Amino acid sequence: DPLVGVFLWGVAHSINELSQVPPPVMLLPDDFKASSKIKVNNHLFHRENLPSHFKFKEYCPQVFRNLRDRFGIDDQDYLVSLTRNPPSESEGRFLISYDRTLVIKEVSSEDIADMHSNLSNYHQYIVKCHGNTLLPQFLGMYRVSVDNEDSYMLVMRNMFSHRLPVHRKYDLKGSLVSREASDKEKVKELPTLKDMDFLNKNQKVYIGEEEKKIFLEKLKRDVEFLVQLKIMDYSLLLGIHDIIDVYAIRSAEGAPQKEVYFMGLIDILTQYDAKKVHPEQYAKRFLDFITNIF
Amino acid sequence: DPLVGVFLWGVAHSINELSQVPPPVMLLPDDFKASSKIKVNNHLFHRENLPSHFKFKEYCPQVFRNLRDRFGIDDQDYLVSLTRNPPSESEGSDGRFLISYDRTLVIKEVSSEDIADMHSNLSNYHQYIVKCHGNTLLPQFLGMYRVSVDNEDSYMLVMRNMFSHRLPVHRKYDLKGSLVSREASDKEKVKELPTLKDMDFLNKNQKVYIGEEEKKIFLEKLKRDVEFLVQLKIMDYSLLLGIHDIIRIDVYAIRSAEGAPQKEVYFMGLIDILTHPEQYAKRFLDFITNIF
Ligand SMILES: CC(C)c1ccccc1-c1nc(NCc2ccccn2)c2c(ccn2C)n1
Ligand SMILES: CC(C)c1ccccc1-c1nc(NCc2ccccn2)c2c(ccn2C)n1
């Protein structure tokens, strides 16, 4: 595909540019309004793999580089992960690094515009909690272009594992209205189940009091932050593996199952799928709901 | 300097793109109309070394890559030579003129009008080079670029150095064999290594002593080189002649004969070039055949 080829070229190009720049000690207001653009135009050359006209734009290169650092990702390992072997495509557009450490989700221009408003607060928040959050870990944000058709790509750390594959998968909002996976959905090998499917299966999460106190104190301040930003309609992604992964929690010793849990916050924007009441209230309902999965 | 920074960035960038492409076995007519352009534009990012706005264009990437190959230059060694260390500047050309740190390459700024002319003859030049197996007194063109910094485009042209990477030139002549007197000005002769001309050559009574075998070869080369320049309707070219007195790769170099009055090394090749002419050639050949 052209869009992926240009994307992988652009990542390689931008990481190389950044190796020349030394990392600042401190970000500045302008670093969050910054970009790097490249317009390439090969006439009667290179016919292989890339198109002859394309653009590539990295949003806030200094901020994303600092976020990669703060989430313990090295710029060379980031490049290796996205380019050394091609990413796989999952069901817009939604790709996983060969090594299954990273996720690349196509988004809309209006999504990029939303991301820009809160990137500064997000950065402050990340510094303040030392990269330790259930929120998505944003690693980079790009606009690849092919003949005046722009496509916005957004890279996040995978909330799921590089090794242990997910057997069951839930999107939990704690809605008053029925949240049920449709029949169309349940024909998939690993379908995205919802609130009602969770309650009907009588699913519980068994992790132990120490681990749970930590997880819920994390979720509380993550959610308080989302309220602060006047954001809502987020879900807890919950993946379960029946028998470095920053979102993973082992089953307690007492547990009725040898299980590993993967939990983090998501959105229509940040969902692990292709692109398709007051916020203080949404939070309280949401927290009640997900406090009762243990 | 911005222009050199962008130039060296572009060379590195263009050689890297070419490492992805495998070299064709055969060029096509389109390879000689081809180009690679890049416009970079960083808003609020990294006002350091490169500017935030610039373009870079490589003319005929496939053709210059084939020419580098045909003149026995490896694309990696070419990149190493232009970028590993910064080039030095000389001030004897009508624009910028740089020498690779390793003194194997020369980078001469030219004009848009020059580039337009030189483009039309690159195909015939390529034919000619294949036909003579890279072995010519003409410049060995290795690459051809347009770096742009603000509104201001500057066309750069890379050639193998006709002079040496080791043995430095002590004396230096530009010979046309003009009807008018060609004389170095007084301003000039104050320089450490001045560019002397026809009349200065004749007055100093300079001769070139190389031996009849080596001279027959050199003159048969110059004849077909010059016949080619006529074919291209080109004139106002000079023979560059540099001399190393033995008091202290090089494809243009010839050692003094045994019988010679001096242990000297000569560097000769054609310059101010790839674009009445029948006349210019005859005068030019007569003149330079009489330097031996
Ligand atoms: C806090 C949020 C992660 C974020 C980080 C950086 C910069 C901006 C944002 C953002 N994220 C959106 N959604 C994604 C989302 C929301 C909640 C949980 C998980 N993922 C947003 C907005 C504004 C409207 N929407 C829909 N801002
Ligand atoms: C065109 C050049 C400006 C020039 C004009 C008149 C007379 C001489 C020269 C000259 N030619 C050098 N190189 C040999 C060379 C030149 C061109 C192509 C290939 N090779 C020079 C310098 C200074 C250092 N070098 C190495 N000047």
Residue numbers in the entry:
A (entry chain A): 45 to 135, 139 to 290, 351 to 383, 403 to 420
B (entry chain B): 45 to 292, 351 to 377, 404 to 420
From the paper:
One class of these enzymes, the phosphatidylinositol 5-phosphate 4-kinases (PI5P4Ks), is functionally expressed in mammals to regulate cellular levels of their substrate, PI5P, or generate specific pools of the PI(4,5)P2 product. The role of the PI5P4Ks in response to cell starvation, a process that leads to the negative regulation of mTORC1 activity to initiate autophagy, has also been documented. The regulation of mTORC1 by PI5P4Kγ results in the basal activation of the complex, whereas reduced PI5P4Kγ activity in starvation conditions initiates autophagy. PI5P4Kγ is therefore a target for small molecule inhibition in the context of neurodegenerative diseases.
Compound 40 was selected for crystallography owing to its balance of potency and solubility. The other three monomer chains (A, C, and D) show the ligand located 18 Å away from the ATP site in a lipid-binding pocket. In this protein conformation, residues Gln378, Tyr379, and Asp380 of the activation loop occupy an inhibitory position in the ATP-binding site. In chain B, where the ligand occupies the ATP site, the allosteric binding site is occupied by residues Ile375 and Leu376, which form the start of a loop that is mostly missing in PI5P4K crystal structures. The binding mode of 40 found in chains A, C, and D of the complex fits well with the findings from mutational studies and HDX-MS experiments by Clarke et al. that suggested the putative PI5P-binding site of PI5P4Kγ, not the ATP-binding site, to be the likely region of interaction of 1.
